[PDB]
Each structure stands twice: as structure tokens, then as C-alpha cells.
Ligand binder design. Structure first.
Ligand SMILES: [Zn+2]
Ligand SMILES: [Zn+2]
Ligand SMILES: [Zn+2]
Ligand SMILES: [Zn+2]
Ligand SMILES: [Zn+2]
Ligand SMILES: [Zn+2]
Lengths: 123, 121
RNA sequence: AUGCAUGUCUAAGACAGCAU
């Protein structure tokens, strides 16, 4: 579909934050869609990119790439999260939706809160 | 904390499935925590792995790596997730990326991209 | 040798690439 504004609600450690991501176009060369946070200093905008690659000479499976980049103003630091999905030509949408919704749920588990928010491995 | 059973509910396209992932030990060599579904064959079970890397002399950043592997009775579906944070990152910043990602994965854009393999234009 | 917020696959592994 057409690249539109994404509004992400009840996020943050608290679940009290909203993030409005405005469309910044689809690059015709590589198909990468770009969004970035409304309302901020260009170089400090929280950013998202998404791409979907078909099988080709270069590639046996479908590959979906999701990337987040969040700047903090200074020493300027960046936080990154990068997601790659891999799905064959014979996967079903039930299978792909399972992985998508699995990961979303995983990201709210005590196991992943400790690893990410607290940087604590399980033992 | 001690590697423990993870129960993920209200998942699948329908929002009506639940996955129960059981502890399969932390690797003494590399710190990698394994979990997996119950089942009769180790190769037809849905898997998750988690790892946290500390900064060393060699690398200046923290890194959290999650892998999902879901086989079907035979093709494999994968998700690979890397988080990369500086030593001066705060927990507010890391939790923001975490929960931002989870929400992103429920948006029309990612439903289109992942479920329907349909990019935006 | 190390590193990667690069990619590819039979995926905690292999391989291609970049950087140092
Ligand atoms: Zn279907
Ligand atoms: Zn992968
Ligand atoms: Zn990497
Ligand atoms: Zn890679
Ligand atoms: Zn690997
Ligand atoms: Zn190489």
C-alpha cells in the first residue's frame, strides 16, 4: 500500500508514550520505506526503515528488514534495533503472522525485559 | 535471572494462539540461552534463543540477540533481532526501543510487509 | 587478527562483503 503515518501508542517503559512516525518516502532504487518522528531536529529524529525483498538470482527466500534508530542529543549516542525475517516461497501468511506476533509478545516477556532494559542475561 | 518457562499468549494472525517455551539451558561456552516448544521431535519444535553481549576491549557496545526458528512439517521460518546500545544508554532508552519495536510489529505497515509480503510505495 | 547499526543460507553456524 501507500506509505502513511504510523502512530505507536502506549509505549515506553511506562507504556504512557506515543510515537508518531511520518512518511519520508519510498526509495525507487531499493524499495526501502523511511519514516521518522514528527516534530524534532532532523538529525535527532527517531527513525524507522522497512524493506521487503523478493526471491531473485540474489536470494532464495523472502527477506523483510526492519530497522529502528533512536538518537540522543549530547555526547550524541544512537540506539539501534535491527530485524531480519526469512520466509520461503511456500510459507503461509499464518506462518509469517505467527512469527511477527510471536516476536511482539516475546518483547514483552520478563526474559526480554531483563536482557534489554536491564542488560541482564538469563542463566 | 534463572532461565525460566516463557508463555506467550494471544498470538497468531487470529490473536488466539499461545506458545509455551520451555528452558533448554544456557550454553556454558557462549552464554546463549535456548528455549523451545514441547514435542516428539527436536527438529519440528518452535525455537527461541537469547543472548546479551557485554562490552570488552574489542567491542565498545552492548548487544542483545534474539533468534526465532519455526519449522513446519519441511521449511523454516526465521526472525533475527539485534539491539545495539552504548554504555551510556539509559534503561528508559532501551525500553523505548523494545516497546517501540513490539508496537511497530502490530502496525498496518508491518502487517502488510510481513503477513502479505507487500512493501509500501 | 578484530569489529560491524551490511547482505546470503541448510542458521548461535557457515559463507559474501565492508571497515580497522
Ligand atoms: Zn492465509
Ligand atoms: Zn536471518
Ligand atoms: Zn550486525
Ligand atoms: Zn547480517
Ligand atoms: Zn549466526
Ligand atoms: Zn568475510
Amino acid at each position: 500500500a501507500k506509505l502513511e503515518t504510523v502512530t505507536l501508542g502506549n509505549i515506553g517503559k511506562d507504556g504512557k508514550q506515543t510515537l508518531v512516525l511520518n512518511p519520508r518516502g519510498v526509495n525507487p532504487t531499493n524499495g526501502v520505506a523511511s519514516l521518522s518522528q514528527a516534530g524534532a531536529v532532523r538529525a535527532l529524529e527517531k527513525r524507522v526503515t522497512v524493506s521487503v525483498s523478493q526471491p531473485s538470482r540474489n536470494r532464495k527466500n523472502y527477506k523483510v528488514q526492519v530497522k529502528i534508530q533512536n538518537p540522543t542529543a549530547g555526547v550524541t549516542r544512537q540506539a539501534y534495533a535491527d530485524v531480519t525475517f526469512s520466509f520461503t516461497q511456500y510459507s503461509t501468511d499464518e506462518e509469517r503472522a505467527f512469527v511477527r506476533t510471536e516476536l511482539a509478545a516475546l518483547l514483552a516477556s520478563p526474559l526480554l525485559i531483563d536482557a534489554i532494559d536491564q542488560l541482564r542475561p538469563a542463566y
